[PDB]
Design a protein around this ligand. Structure first.
Ligand code: NAD
Ligand code: NAD
Ligand code: USQ
Ligand code: USQ
Lengths: 392, 392
C-alpha cells in the first residue's frame, strides 16, 4: 505494498511515522518543505539532539534496510507542486502532518497568526482537492488536535455528540472551542474536511491527538542519523518533554499558572501505531471518522510530580516553579475525554512508566550540554500579541 | 457622531447600510477594494439595474445631503492598507461586509475555493488585529451566516446551546455544519472572533443573517446614482430576487431539486435596521454576541408560490421548473431557527408582503430588457468542481 504519502515527514511525528510505515512494508514518500527547520534558525531554537538532514536520514534508512522512501521537497500550498507529487507517487493513503503546529508560534504576532491559518487551512484544502482530482479513493489520515474541543463542563466525545433538544434528537459535530490561532486552524481544517466527505465522497479520519512525549521509536534508534528531534524550547517544546529536559539541566519545572490544566497524552511510539491502525483500517467512502488519539490524561501538576519522582531516582533534586501563565486558558477545569475507537481497532498502548521517564531523563542528561537554557522560559504572551513582526 | 467603518461598503448590503448609517448621523467611511465589480467583468455578469461608480455614489450623497462618506480603496488582506485606514478614520464600530459571499463562486474550482477562504479568513483576522492594536474598544459587527448551522434535526439557537450530557450541564457554541466553502469560511470567522473576545477582550456581534431580498431602501431611492445592485445570475443571485426577475422575463422559476430547502429571509430594509441596532446597542468587552438575523422562514416551494401569485396580479403567467440541484444539501428537512434577540432590541420588521413583491416584480419588469437570460440557469456543480481555473 500500500502506498502512503507522509506530508510533514521530516517533522517530529512525521519522521517517526514514515520510518515505521516503511518498516511495516508500505511504499512511502515524504512531502515536506522543511520550513520547520527554518523556524529553528529564525527564532534561535535547536533540538536537544542533533538530527541529520532529510536527505541523509533517507539515505541511512536505505543503507540499513534497502528500502527507499521517496522525497518531494515543496510547499503544499503550491498546488502545482502538490499535484505533481500526487500524480508521481499515486498514494493510496495520505497522512497529513504538514502544518504549523505550535500554539505559541501562532501567537507571536499578526504575521505568524496569519501564516499559521493560511498555511494550515489552504494547505489542507489543496490536499483535499488533490485527492478529489487525482485519487478520489485515497484515504486522508489527518492530524487534528484534542485542543479543538477546549475544556467544556461535559464529557468530550470522539468528534460527535448525540443531543436531545426541545423534544428532538440528533447527532451533531462536537462543539469546538480552540484556545490559540493554531488550535483554531485545526478546527477550520476539520470542518472543511467533514464537508468534502459529504459533498465529494472523500474518506477521511481526523486524529485528534493529545500531547506527544518521548524521542525514541524502534526505527529511529537503529542509527544516529535516524534520530528524531526532541524540542524543549518554550515555542515548540511541549509539557512533558520540556519538564524532562528541565529536570536534567537543573532548571525548576515550569508550571504555568495553577497547573491544573489537564490534557490527554501519548508516547510517540503510540503515535506511529495509531496512524498505522488508521491506515490499515480505512474510513469508508463519504465517512469522516474522528478518533481521540491519546492514552492517558494528566494535569500539569501531575506531570511535575512524576518527573520529580523519576528525577529523584537519578539524583536530580528536581524543583518546581510557578510561572505567570503566558496563555489564556482554564487552569482548573473538568476533563473527561472519551478514547476507545483506537483501542477497539487493536491499539496496544505504552502507558507512561518509570522506565520511560528514566530513559527520557537519562537521554536529556546525556545531551544536557546542548541545552540552551535561555529558551526554556516562555516569552510569548497570548494577550500582548502585536502586529509588528518580532525578531527573537 | 459615532464613527463607523463599513468594510465592503460598495456591496449590496454594505452600500445600503453605509447610506442608512450616514443618514442616522453616524460619521461613516467605506473600505472596499471593489473586487466584487471585477468578478462581474470576469464571469460576464451584470446587475439588473445599472449602478454608479463608488466615487459618483458618494459624490451624489454629498450633493444631496451635504454629508461626506470617507472612502478608502484597498484590500483588507493588505494589513498596511487596513492599518492606515483604521488609524486615519479611528472607528468606534466596524461593520464587516467585506468578504466573498457567494456559495456558487466558492465552488467554481480550487482557485476560487482557496481565494474564498483565504480572503475571508485572513481579512477577518486582520480586522481583529487592527481593532486590538489601534482601537481595542472598537465594536466589531460581523456578518456571519445562518448557513453556519446547516439543517440539524433540532431547533437552531442564536449561537449557543445549553446541553446536559452524562449528568453535567454547560452552554456551548452551537454545532456548525456548513454546506459550501463560502459558508465554511464564515464558520471559521466566527470561531476566530469568539477566541479573540475571550483572549483579548474584543467586543463583537456576529450577525448570522438569512437570505436578503429587495433592492430599495429609503436612502438608495433618493437618486438614480444611489441605486443599489440587484443580482439575478446563478452565481451571485439569491432565491427570491432571482425568482422575481425570472417571473418578469417569462422564465420558469428555477426550483433546485425538491424545493423543500427552508431558510430564514429578510428585507434589505431590515438588514440596515438590524445593523444599526447592533451598533447602537454594542456588545460588552469580551462578549461575543450572536444574533440570528432574519424575519421569516420560507421554503423554496413557498417562495415559488408567492411569486407566482404576485406575478398573476401583473399578468406574468409565472411557471415553475425543477432543476437538477447543482448543490449537495437536504431538499426536505426540519427547520426551526430561533430569532428574538434583535426583536428584543427593538427591531420593527418589514415582513414579506404583496406590496413588496408587487414593487420588486414591477422593478424587474421595468429593467427586463437588461436581463441576460443566459446567466439564469446554474452551471456550477458542488460535486464536479475541479482544479483547473475556469473561464465562464
Ligand atoms: N507534537 C505534538 O505533541 C503533537 C500533538 C498532537 C498533534 N500533533 C500534530 O501532528 C502534526 C505534526 O506535528 P509535529 O510535532 O510533528 O510537527 P513538526 O513541526 O515537527 O512537523 C511538521 C512538518 O510539516 C512540515 N510542513 C509544515 N508546513 C508545511 C507545508 N506548507 N508544506 C510542506 N510541509 C510543511 C514542516 O517543515 C515539518 O517538517 C501537526 O498537525 C500537529 O499539530 C503533534
Ligand atoms: N446578500 C445576501 O443575501 C446576504 C445574506 C446573508 C449574509 N450576507 C453577508 O453580508 C456580507 C455582504 O454581502 P453582500 O451581498 O453585500 O456582498 P457583495 O459581494 O455585494 O459585497 C461585498 C463587498 O465586499 C468587498 N470586498 C470583498 N473582499 C474584500 C476585501 N478583501 N477587501 C476589501 N473589500 C472587499 C467587495 O468588493 C464588495 O463590494 C457578506 O458577509 C455576506 O455573506 C449577505
Ligand atoms: O512548560 C510548560 C508547557 C506547557 N504547559 C501547559 O501544558 C498544557 C499543554 O501545553 P503544551 O505546550 O504541551 O501543548 P499545546 O500547546 O496544547 O500543543 C501541543 O499539543 C497539542 C495537543 S492538544 O492541545 O490538541 O491536545 C497539539 O495539537 C499541538 O500541535 C502541540 O504543539 C497547556 O495548558 C500549557 O499552558 C505548562 O504548564 N508548562
Ligand atoms: O434559483 C435558485 C436559487 C437558490 N435555490 C435554493 O435556495 C436556497 C438558498 O440559496 P441562495 O442561493 O438564495 O442562498 P445561499 O447560497 O444560501 O447564500 C446567500 O444566503 C446566505 C444566507 S445563509 O445560507 O447563511 O442563511 C448568505 O450567507 C450568503 O452570503 C448569500 O449569498 C438553497 O437551498 C438553494 O439551493 C433554489 O432552489 N433556486
Amino acid at each position: 505494498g500500500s502506498r502512503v504519502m507522509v506530508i510533514g515527514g521530516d517533522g517530529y511525528c512525521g519522521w517517526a511515522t514514515a520510518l515505521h510505515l516503511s518498516k511495516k512494508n508500505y511504499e512511502v514518500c515524504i512531502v515536506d518543505n522543511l520550513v520547520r527547520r527554518l523556524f529553528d534558525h529564525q527564532l534561535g531554537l535547536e533540538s536537544l539532539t542533533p538530527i541529520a538532514s532529510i536527505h541523509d536520514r533517507i539515505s541511512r534508512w536505505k543503507a540499513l534496510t534497502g528500502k527507499s522512501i521517496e522525497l518531494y521537497v515543496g510547499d503544499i500550498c503550491d498546488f502545482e507542486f502538490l499535484a505533481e507529487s500526487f500524480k508521481s507517487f499515486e498514494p493510496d493513503s495520505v497522512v497529513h502532518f504538514g502544518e504549523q503546529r505550535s500554539a505559541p508560534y501562532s501567537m507571536i504576532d499578526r504575521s505568524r497568526a496569519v501564516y499559521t491559518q493560511h498555511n494550515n487551512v489552504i494547505g489542507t484544502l489543496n490536499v483535499l482537492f488533490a485527492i478529489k482530482e487525482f485519487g478520489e479513493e485515497c484515504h486522508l489520515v489527518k492530524l487534528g488536535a484534542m485542543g479543538e474541543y477546549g475544556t467544556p463542563n461535559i464529557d468530550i466525545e470522539e468528534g460527535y455528540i448525540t443531543i436531545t433538544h426541545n423534544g428532538r434528537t440528533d447527532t451533531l459535530p462536537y462543539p469546538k472551542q480552540a484556545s490559540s490561532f493554531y488550535h483554531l486552524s485545526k478546527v477550520h481544517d476539520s470542518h472543511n474536511i467533514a464537508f468534502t466527505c459529504k459533498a465529494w465522497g472523500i474518506r477521511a479520519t481526523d486524529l485528534n491527538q493529545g500531547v506527544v512525549y518521548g524521542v525514541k521509536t524502534d526505527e529511529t534508534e537503529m542509527h544516529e542519523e535516524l534520530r528524531n528531534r526532541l524540542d524543549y524550547d518554550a515555542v515548540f517544546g511541549t509539557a512533558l518533554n520540556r519538564f524532562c529536559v528541565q529536570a536534567a539541566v537543573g532548571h525548576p519545572l515550569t508550571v504555568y499558572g495553577k497547573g491544573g490544566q489537564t490534557r490527554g497524552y501519548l508516547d510517540i511510539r503510540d503515535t506511529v501505531q495509531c496512524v498505522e491502525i488508521a491506515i490499515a483500517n480505512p474510513a469508508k467512502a463519504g465517512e469522516f471518522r474522528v478518533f481521540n488519539q491519546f492514552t492517558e490524561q494528566f494535569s500539569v501538576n501531575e506531570l511535575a510530580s512524576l518527573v520529580t519522582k523519576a528525577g529523584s531516582k537519578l539524583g536530580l533534586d528536581v524543583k518546581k516553579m510557578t510561572v505567570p501563565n503566558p496563555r489564556v486558558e482554564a487552569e482548573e477545569h473538568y476533563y473527561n475525554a472519551k478514547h476507545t475507537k483506537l483501542m477497539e481497532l487493536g491499539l496496544e498502548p505504552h502507558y507512561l512508566s518509570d522506565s520511560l521517564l528514566d530513559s527520557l531523563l537519562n537521554f536529556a542528561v546525556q545531551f544536557k550540554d546542548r541545552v540552551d537554557t535561555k529558551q526554556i522560559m516562555p516569552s510569548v504572551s497570548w494577550k500582548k500579541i502585536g502586529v509588528k513582526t518580532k525578531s527573537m
